[PDB]
Amino acid sequence: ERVLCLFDVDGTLTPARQKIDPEVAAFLQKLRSRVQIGVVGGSDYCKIAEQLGDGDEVIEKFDYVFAENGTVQYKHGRLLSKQTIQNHLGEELLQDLINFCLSYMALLRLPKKRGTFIEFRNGMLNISPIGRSCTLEERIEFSELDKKEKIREKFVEALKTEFAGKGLTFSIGGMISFDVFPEGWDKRYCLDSLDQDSFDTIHFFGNETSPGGNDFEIFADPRTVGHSVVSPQDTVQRCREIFFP
């Protein structure tokens, strides 16, 4: 009787980094008459809020809003607290990681550098060799240089080796940055809080459920019924089959 559908945002519910089609959002609300619904995204809260309504309408349209993989949580309109990356990792390791990064980037010579090479978020560190504060034209410029030169990839190889065995995971999401977060702090992080909400079934939907994609772990977890989708339209049809047959 208590079921939750939980959705990746990008490519599952919305075109990536863009806004949800009204027909999609309309279906979701209809679906809500049979199940609770929720979203989990890698992005921070405001980015998700923007794709999924006006202002803070997102926390109203969805029963659960897990931003930054669930290190930041909204449940039934209310913001829950957040375990901090430094609390979990401790100051010594966090700073070891940070100092490794500053040192590596100091030796990097790029066409352009800007600011915010290291962004401190709730559940990860976003590392960006060009600097997060560049224009779109500068994103594209660096992005093309990165493919040629594999700047982020090399950086991530060096980081992985250096911190081997120490509990860190790395990404490479987008044109200019990569993420660093504690082992476990992928999308699965949200499931722990969900465990205390007594659902009989948690269905997960994603578009990156293949090995490597950021939906894989949450998709494969024994706490969720996994579904793999290719489009928001695919997602909608899938829910039609399962919940409106």
* Annotated binding residue 78: no
Enter the tokens of residue 151.
């700047």
Q: Could you say whether residue 63 binds Mg ion (CB under 5 A)?
A: no
* Annotated binding residue 186: no
Please state, in angstroms and rounded to a whole number, the distance separating the CA atoms of residues 21 and 242: 21
What are the backbone dihedrals phi and psi of residue 63, each rounded to the nearest 5 degrees, phi first?
A: -70, -35
200 classed as catalytic: no
Q: Which is nearer to Mg ion, 128 or 214 (CB)?
A: 214
Please state, in angstroms and rounded to a whole number, the distance separating the CA atoms of residues 229 and 236: 9
Q: Which is nearer to Mg ion, 126 or 214 (CB)?
A: 214
DSSP H or E run through 238: helix 232-243
**Tokens 């060096």 map to which residue?**
158
Stretch that binds Mg ion, among 4-12, 105-113, 134-142, 174-182 (CB under 5 A): 4-12
Q: Could you say whether residue 50 binds Mg ion (CB under 5 A)?
A: no
Other Cβ atoms within 10 Å of 71 Cβ, number: 22
Q: In the range 193-232, which residues lie near Mg ion by CB under 5 A? A: 207-208, 221, 224, 226
Q: Could you say whether residue 10 binds Mg ion (CB under 5 A)?
A: yes
Contact in structure between 209 and 230 (CB atoms under 8 Å): no
Q: In the complex, what is the shortest distance from the CB of residue 77 to Mg ion, in angstroms, rounded to a whole number?
A: 25
Sheet holding 178-182, edge to edge: 118-120, 125-127, 178-182, 168-170
Contact in structure between 155 and 107 (CB atoms under 8 Å): no
8 classed as catalytic: yes
Binding-site sequence positions: 8, 10, 17, 121, 132, 139, 175, 177, 179, 207, 219, 221, 224
What residue ranges bind Mg ion (CB under 5 A)?
Answer: 8, 10-11, 207-208, 221, 224, 226
Binding-site sequence positions for Mg(2+): 8, 10, 207, 219, 221, 224
Just list the catalytic residues. 8, 10
